Amino acid sequence: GLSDGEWQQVLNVWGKVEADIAGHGQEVLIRLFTGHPETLEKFDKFKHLKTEAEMKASEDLKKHGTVVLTALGGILKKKGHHEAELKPLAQSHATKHKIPIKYLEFISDAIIHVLHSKHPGDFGADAQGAMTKALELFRNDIAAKYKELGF
Numbered sequence: 001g002l003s004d005g006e007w008q009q010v011l012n013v014w015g016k017v018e019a020d021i022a023g024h025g026q027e028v029l030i031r032l033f034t035g036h037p038e039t040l041e042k043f044d045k046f047k048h049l050k051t052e053a054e055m056k057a058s059e060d061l062k063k064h065g066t067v068v069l070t071a072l073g074g075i076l077k078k079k080g081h082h083e084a085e086l087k088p089l090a091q092s093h094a095t096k097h098k099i100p101i102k103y104l105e106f107i108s109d110a111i112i113h114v115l116h117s118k119h120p121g122d123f124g125a126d127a128q129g130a131m132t133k134a135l136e137l138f139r140n141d142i143a144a145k146y147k148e149l150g151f
Helices: 004-018 021-035 037-042 052-057 059-076 087-095 101-118 125-149
Strands: none
Touching: 004 021, 004 059, 004 101, 004 125, 021 037, 021 052, 021 059, 021 101, 037 101, 059 125, 087 125, 101 125
């Protein structure tokens, strides 16, 4: 449970994302891919990319970053009331793409990193705390369904 002041910081921060969704999207995935190359393996569409340069040039990659950040963006605006928006994602990532929870943690760290990088000194210590908390709630709720499903 984030406090109400906390959600407000989450959603204010995410305003910054929404002004350039595709740009943040791409950098998040890029940071994820170059930081944890095994994650590349989950994407047949992306397993071809070797170089950061290749990633940056890929318009598909930007597309997919937009998908991933709109989804998350939609979840966060539910302020924790995300059960329905969540079962789909959990059930598919666990038996289909077989995404370890670890990867959810990788992409969370990567959103944080991207935000500091795009917004140095506009991403305060409380906002950081709030965004981390939000990203933890989500992960923990996916983690619950994953246990249920035995992943």
